[PDB]
Symmetry: C3
Subunit: 145 residues, 3 copies
């Protein structure tokens, strides 16, 4: 999956960024079974004051998580993943839950590419990884914390 | 909902940003009944020359709106909404309608979380808002303009 | 279509941005028939180390391409399109494919707006251009490379 995380510039230190990204990555892995290295967290930082709620300009506490996933998972599983991302990002950023928005969008895996390769269906991460070439597997393995 | 608003850096002044956020939030609340405080506008500024049309680099005047909605509204409604957003953003930004692009994407409300809570179906935000923790109503109420 | 391209600041020179936008645009045109000037490439830059893969901060190499299309094309065509953007962006940015990620999302054309007009269905672009005003046609014609 890709998680776009929109935050206010300098609201998260490098450490907080690391922690929030490990929080989402672990949640995704623990609930879906997708390998760690298939989960991308991409921080989009903007100047604080670039976020309006009901027209009211915000300080710098709002986090928006747009998660882009393969289709095929249940409403239930996705609900549990969204709630775990709320809880865990709240703890990682030290930001109260009222500031956290999370949207999940899904697409057919056949129109989804990661590391230059088309993704498999959600059950099939193991076979797929096993059939990649050697150097591709090697590159992927180093993106695990 | 969330409206991602991609603009060139230093194209919209803070007052023009406020104006545009208003125009959008007004459009959404007017045409859907969704309470003012559930609509985020999130400005994403890039340096001019980061937008290409047909391979031709642009100046600083393109505006692209990406609206992220709950599923369940009619296409007639959605067309009316996209048209009003074009009109009112064109006026509030003093930008010609030929520079404005607007895409709506939709998701099940069961996988959309705002203020740390799961969103209702599009007609039912009243009873959703009533049944909430007193402090959550209190915070939500402040983000209205 | 709108292709959102998430890259790191300093990664692509101006000349490389041009070459990448050109390759994406020529791929979309050559495989779907949509006129050049309808294709937007929007580069979003963030400082290096904003991307995490599997919880491990990356340098500045990864390229994420989020293409927003209208519905109604085959999975065969979308697979060819994604693979060709991978190949032509890898060549044009002189980046290895293992850094390239590509997601296609689709929406009904009735909720999509380019140059302030509503898009047609994917093969009716000719009649659609032939019912636009003179000045709109001229403005769109200047966006061809």
């Amino acid at each position: 999956p890709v998680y776009m995380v929109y935050v206010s510039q300098d609201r998260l230190t490098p450490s907080a960024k690391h922690a929030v990204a490990k929080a989402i990555t672990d949640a995704h892995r623990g609930l879906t079974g997708t390998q760690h290295f298939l989960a991308q967290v991409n921080f989009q930082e903007q100047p604080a004051g670039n976020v309006f709620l009901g027209g009211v300009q915000q300080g710098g506490d709002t986090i928006f998580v747009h998660g882009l996933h393969r289709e095929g998972r249940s409403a239930d599983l996705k609900g549990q993943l969204a709630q775990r991302i709320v809880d865990d990002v709240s703890v990682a950023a030290e930001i109260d839950r009222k500031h956290i928005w999370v949207f999940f969008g899904e697409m057919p895996a056949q129109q989804m590419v990661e590391y230059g390769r088309f993704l498999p269906q959600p059950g099939h991460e193991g076979e797929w990884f096993d059939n990649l070439s050697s150097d591709e597997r090697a590159f992927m393995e180093t993106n695990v914390d």
